[PDB]
């Protein structure tokens, strides 16, 4: 299947004292593999998956240098954007950045992206052509002009189509045992009486990877959304994910209802029925 490498960065300003809190996370697909936290003791990029620990000192020194460089850019930007928006020095504000690259089943480049946000709203983003920028307002338009003059998109494109993909492939091979394994959802149904005439059926998907999944209910072979509840997909804490979907049904009619589970690790979708 397809794969991605993505880095996420958050900086939060601290007007009362000191420098911004800065947290960086790197992922391959849905697996976190590195982190940096300005509040942590190491002041280094740190490993979070066994298959990255084999990288040598030059890797860790370089990733620490670069992630600190990201943090300083964010710090500068928090000041600059406070000025663009004519905001007080007394408030805390946030910059968020996400970039990365996707490859297809053949491990060839599919797409790249670089998104930047201020106070939780779109600020500037690289378009899918990897040449142009989308600026949400006139402050971001000022940034866009700066980044055009500095030819940022050209350097970013070269990374996204080259280095990003090449290192993603390296990680996919080094971490093959887990990164190239799909964990199909372990599925079951539970039944809960909610009155003399109503019952709830809850369809469970547990311990699955990657996180993408679809759970749907049908009644007598037709999709039903009325009287259903679908929770957000949530982390188990061991690298896998969980989800459930529930439906309220007249007691005694449980057999009409089927839960349908689609996931990359299933050759065919699963159908569950309370029988």
């Amino acid at each position: 299947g397809s794969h991605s490498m993505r880095y996420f960065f958050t900086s939060v300003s601290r007007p009362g004292r000191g420098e911004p809190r800065f947290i960086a996370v790197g992922y391959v697909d849905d697996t976190q593999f590195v982190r940096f936290d300005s509040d942590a003791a190491s002041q280094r990029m740190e490993p979070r998956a066994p298959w990255i620990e084999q990288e040598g000192p030059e890797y860790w020194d370089g990733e620490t240098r670069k992630v600190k460089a990201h943090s300083q850019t964010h710090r500068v930007d928090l000041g600059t954007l406070r000025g663009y928006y004519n905001q007080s020095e007394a408030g805390s504000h946030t910059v968020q950045r996400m970039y990365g690259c996707d490859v297809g089943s053949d491990w060839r480049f599919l797409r790249g992206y670089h998104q930047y946000a201020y106070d939780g709203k779109d600020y500037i983003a690289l378009k899918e052509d990897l040449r142009s920028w989308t600026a949400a307002d006139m402050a971001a338009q000022t940034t866009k002009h700066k980044w055009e003059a500095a030819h940022v998109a050209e350097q970013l494109r070269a990374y996204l189509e080259g280095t990003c993909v090449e290192w993603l492939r390296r990680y996919l091979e080094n971490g093959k045992e887990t990164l190239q394994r799909t964990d199909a959802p372990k599925t079951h149904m539970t039944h809960h009486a909610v009155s003399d005439h109503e019952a709830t059926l809850r369809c469970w998907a547990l311990s699955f990877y990657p996180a993408e999944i679809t759970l749907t209910w049908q009644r007598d072979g037709e999709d039903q959304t009325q009287d259903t509840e679908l929770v957000e997909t949530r982390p188990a804490g061991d690298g896998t994910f969980q989800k459930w979907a529930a439906v309220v049904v007249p007691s005694g009619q449980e057999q009409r209802y089927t839960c349908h589970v689609q996931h990359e690790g299933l050759p065919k979708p699963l159908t569950l029925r309370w029988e």
Binding site: G62, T80, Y99, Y116, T143, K146, V152, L156, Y159, W167
Partner: peptide
């Protein structure tokens, strides 16, 4: 691997 090219300021 992180991007290295200059993290252009806004």
């Amino acid at each position: 691997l992180l991007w290295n090219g200059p993290m252009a300021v806004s």
